[PDB]
Amino acid sequence: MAHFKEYQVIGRRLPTESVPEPKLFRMRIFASNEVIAKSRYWYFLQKLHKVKKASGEIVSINQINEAHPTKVKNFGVWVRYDSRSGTHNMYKEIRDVSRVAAVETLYQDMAARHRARFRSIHILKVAEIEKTADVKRQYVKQFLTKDLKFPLPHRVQKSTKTFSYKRPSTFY
């Protein structure tokens, strides 16, 4: 829905006299800012435990930064999304340098190919593929070839003026 950041949200139920110091629950949330991340925390917690915002509290929220933002990685993502009729599971693989920059690619692909909005997509798990040959999508394996090499034919150059005085060329 915007540029994505990864937030760690830790919540808890309100302590009572019968059971003081209740259990702590944590989950990673991808959100535009801090306000959305806390709201998404209660959305997922209400699907797992008998608790809501009124009877619970947020213990701590922290932003997660990539350990190695400048290393190319292969990411496998599991998603649960709702189509116009029914719910479907899906596994896709995205090659990028960070989790935040790979989730945004996933949301663009889901909207472009399946017409799925943000409100109807659940991110089950995002994991990094560590070993080659564990990639099972051919559109990613083709970039893992030894000594990758490809040209860029038919270059188009932007023009700042309305008129040009020579026929352009598309060489590169």
Binding site: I10, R12, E21, K23, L24, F25, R26, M27, R28, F44, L45, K47, L48, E57, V59, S60, W78, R80, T87, H88, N89, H122, I123, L124, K125
Partner: protein
């Protein structure tokens, strides 16, 4: 044509509770009412005499008259754009002592005690109620309570 009798649309209003039919318990006739008491109206289906109209069901009034087996109740009824004063003659089976103001009698009694106790000690007794104030700061210890990571579950049928 249309029917607008005295007891119309009272099929379920005047029914007795489940497994609560028969005679009336004796404590109803032993309670005493005075002028100025605040009571609420709830009609009893077993007694067809002195039974209030369906409008006054679940309404609270003030006693203004006492009789042999009945009392007078004053209720303000909204008619049009103003309120009118209504006087009802209802038997004691159809009313009970409302507890809306009964709780208020404890706080005024407690306010007098608290004011007297703090009169010889400190000013500003704080004799006013306050709403639920926002929670203060706290520290949550993780000793034996390490957070557990949760993830959304996939889709399944189980039908």
């Amino acid at each position: 044509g249309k029917s607008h009798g005295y007891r119309s649309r009272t099929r379920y209003m005047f029914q007795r509770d489940f497994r609560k039919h028969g005679a009336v318990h004796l404590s109803t006739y032993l309670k005493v009412y005075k002028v100025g008491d605040i009571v609420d109206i709830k009609a009893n289906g077993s007694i067809q005499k002195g039974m209030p109209h369906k409008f006054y069901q679940g309404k609270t009034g003030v006693v203004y008259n006492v009789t042999k087996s009945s009392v007078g109740v004053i209720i303000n009824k909204m008619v049009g754009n103003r309120y009118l004063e209504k006087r009802l003659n209802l038997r004691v089976e159809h009313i009970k002592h409302s507890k809306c103001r009964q709780e208020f009698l404890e706080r005024v009694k407690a306010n007098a005690a608290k004011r007297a106790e703090a009169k010889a000690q400190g000013v500003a007794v704080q004799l006013k109620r306050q709403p639920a104030q926002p929670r203060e700061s706290r520290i949550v210890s993780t000793e034996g309570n390490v957070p557990q990571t949760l993830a959304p579950v996939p889709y399944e049928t189980f039908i």
